[PDB]
Write a structure and sequence with these properties.
Two copies of one chain form a homodimer.
Chain A (H helix, E strand, L loop, with lengths): L9 E5 L3 H12 L3 E6 L12 E4 L5 H9 L3 E4 L6 H10 L7 H6 L2 H10 L7 E4 L2 H11 L3 E5 L9 E4 L5 H10 L2 E5 L5 E9 L5 E3 L3 E6 L2 E7 L5 H17 L4 E9 L5 E7 L9 H4 L4 H10 L12 E7 L3 H6 L7 E5 L10 E8 L3 H10 L4 H6 L5
Parallel strand pairs in A: 1-2, 1-4, 2-3
Antiparallel strand pairs in A: 5-8, 6-7, 6-8, 9-10, 9-11, 9-13, 11-12, 12-15, 13-14, 15-17, 16-17
Helix pairs in contact in A: 1-10, 2-3
The complex binds adenosine-5'-diphosphate (ADP) (2 copies), 5-aminoimidazole ribonucleotide (2 copies) and magnesium ion (2 copies).
The site of one adenosine-5'-diphosphate has 14 residues of chain A, from strand 6, strand 8 and strand 14.
PDB class: lyase
Keywords: carboxylase, lyase
Assembly: dimeric
């Protein structure tokens, strides 16, 4: 309510990946102490934490131990089960609560909640068996997209249905998992907005980012998004309605499709700092992580003004040697590396924020470094 | 020379105070590891370091152990025995070198480096005994200031001589330590410029800050400095010349006196990030701390554009209670606290950067919080 977590207190983080690490580094500038729970020793967050607890996420004893030594608890890992979430809510201080998190773990549930909040989404149907798939294909026609409702840390369970010739692969997906069938949205841009809401109801919204995915992994975020002033205003208003309606405490990332015609469809929500918000570390007055900490500790929120245009580029395992090799060429670039021990080809290892007065020059900078030639080549065929 | 210390390597820091802490936080965002040597456990910097070495600064064994685990070494306070820095220069990797520190560690030898580069200083005389003090006073007249050549602590530091009646206070200081007597500079404003130069010779300068001291402790830094454009250009030019002539690697803070006739006297040099540079964490494209790491590791330097006007306000021991009690009123304020355990009245505990499109609105916010009532005379 009016409850404040003062500097000097301990912030407990569930999950020790890069999101937890950047939260921690933000909290440390303000003099907070950090405890982290992660299943692997020497996690990115653990490298900046005062206290490390190595345990499984579903281990209630370990969760209780984190809670016991923390003045406030937050998470970067979303898939926390109901028994741990309830324990934390009632026996520790978890200002984000569990309601929003319970709405966002299932695609169908999420879409229902978005519509209940008064916002538009692609027309969708629940698919729990072959018969519901057949009906959904009838009602939505082609083209359409069948996705799993839960899990998939990459986007593994997705089948795009362009013709009757696609039905058989969709049936295979519907066999392995509860699914959702969505109308295919013709759109020009994928954009996202990070919205922040504090314990006391104060809200701030970041600018709209334009997001470029390659292999279903975020490649670039571009701010300002290359859209009309009217599309931006709409994306921002939608994000605000969601934060109000969902009674957000903490950070909410809202991912959207923007059509040439100026309509927005909400694609998905993440109740946490998000990859499409990393630009904020170097280009805005407050980062999504500093905002996250203020929101849960109930400090006044910072400003979210864009101070300079930016292009964020992800560094995957496949890019790390190229980055190190090209280090002398990183003028106008702000490098972030997460300290991950084991590199893997599509593992997120870091990101680089390219700040420039002109967005097209920053984009040209990423191309001229030649680190992401693979991504740039995959970006054709285009449309 | 073209040598590069890559992200992933370990940076060793001598000293575990707030400057080292903020270096470390900057370094970790790029994926560096951090070793720190400090005599007291759980120092501000150790709370963020991967490796902590608790030992004295003169403990050569521990210094050896610092070098061993580090791919590059830097320091975060000046009162290191320049002899320890000479061991690291020859047997480890200390791109900043020992010579720049030795020159700026002594107010007298510092004057000489400034004069060599051709810039104005207050006319000065070395004072080693009462006879020399008498001759210096006769030569330089009133008003004048007596300063110890070395040391940045203790209950002495300096004596301002307005008239003959201040002399007895000066005689006491003159007996305690080696001093210089300097002509009093009539200045409109104190300003500072932080200049950065990498191992490869790339040079960046930050915007000129106007600094306001109370009890000879920095209270506020104001950026942009409320000075004319020509004065700003001169400050910047003077800092570049200094970095050039001193063969600077790393960070250099240059403190200056801006006079009514538009002249600049160099007051003091610091071969490290400086309190008057903390504004850069929130108002510049790159902080003095990110620039420092980039300089010594030989990465390209970041840009130093002022992205928004700012007033940095110091948080001393006397203020910490007020800050924590007033946290709910810090809209538009960016708070930095260093993790120091013991508040002492005039100990630097943290700082707050107040960002606002209007410098006077930032300044007014500082007053309206009422935390610094002591300072606002
Ligand atoms: N209804 C739809 N219409 C058009 N394109 C879609 C639709 N659903 C998904 N996509 C495309 O597929 C990509 C992945 O879908 P998404 O729902 O974001 O799953 P994930 O969270 O696994 O990435 C999106 O970035 C978008 O390009
Ligand atoms: N020659 C001088 N003329 C006028 N004021 C001075 C002079 N020297 C120092 N001061 C004032 O006293 C303050 C402290 O002096 P300084 O030499 O910076 O000592 P310290 O390095 O211990 O702070 C300065 O910030 C300035 O305001
Ligand atoms: N991307 C994402 C979605 N939800 C969490 N993450 C971040 O990705 C890390 C997982 O990365 P890895 O699989 O490389 O350990 C998590 O800990 C968290 O920071
Ligand atoms: N202010 C200053 C001038 N030179 C170094 N410092 C910083 O102040 C710390 C010492 O402060 P304290 O004496 O409060 O511990 C040092 O380690 C360094 O970071
Ligand atoms: Mg997606
Ligand atoms: Mg000084």
């Amino acid at each position: 309510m009016t409850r404040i977590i003062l500097p000097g207190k301990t912030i407990g983080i569930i999950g020790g990946g890069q999101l937890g690490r950047m939260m921690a580094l933000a909290a440390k500038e303000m003099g907070y102490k950090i405890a982290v729970l992660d299943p692997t020793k020497n996690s990115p967050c653990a490298q900046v934490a005062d206290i490390e607890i190595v345990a499984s996420y579903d281990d209630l004893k370990a969760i209780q131990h984190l809670a016991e030594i923390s003045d406030v608890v937050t998470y970067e890992f979303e898939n926390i089960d109901y028994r741990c979430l309830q324990w934390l809510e009632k026996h520790a201080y978890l200002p984000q609560g569990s309601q929003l998190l319970s709405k966002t773990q299932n695609r169908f549930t999420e879409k229902n909640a978005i519509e209940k909040a008064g916002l538009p989404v692609a027309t969708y149907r629940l698919v729990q068996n072959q018969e519901q798939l057949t009906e959904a294909i009838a009602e939505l026609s082609y083209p359409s997209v069948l996705k799993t409702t839960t899990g998939g840390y990459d986007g593994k369970g997705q089948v795009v249905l362009r013709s009757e010739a696609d039905v058989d692969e969709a049936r295979k997906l519907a066999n392995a998992a509860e699914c959702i069938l969505e109308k295919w949205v013709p759109f020009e841009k994928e954009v996202s907005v990070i919205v922040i809401r504090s314990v006391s109801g104060e809200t701030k919204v970041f600018p709209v980012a334009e997001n470029i995915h390659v292999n279903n992994i975020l490649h670039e975020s571009i701010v300002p998004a290359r859209i009309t002033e009217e599309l931006s205003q709409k994306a921002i208003a939608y994000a605000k309605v969601l934060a109000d309606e969902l009674e957000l405490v903490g950070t909410l990332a809202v991912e959207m499709f923007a059509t040439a015609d100026g309509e927005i469809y909400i694609n998905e929500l993440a109740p946490r700092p998000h990859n499409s918000g990393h630009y904020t570390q170097d280009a805005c007055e407050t980062s999504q992580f500093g905002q996250h900490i203020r929101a849960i500790c109930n400090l006044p929120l910072g400003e979210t003004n864009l101070l300079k245009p930016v292009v964020m580029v992800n560094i995957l395992g496949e890019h790390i040697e190229g980055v190190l090799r090209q280090v002398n060429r990183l003028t106008g670039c702000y490098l972030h590396l997460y300290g991950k021990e084991e590199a893997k080809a599509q593992r997120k290892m870091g990101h680089v924020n390219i700040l420039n007065d002109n967005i097209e020059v920053a984009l040209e900078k990423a191309k001229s470094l030649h680190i992401w030639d693979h991504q740039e080549q995959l970006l054709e065929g285009k449309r």
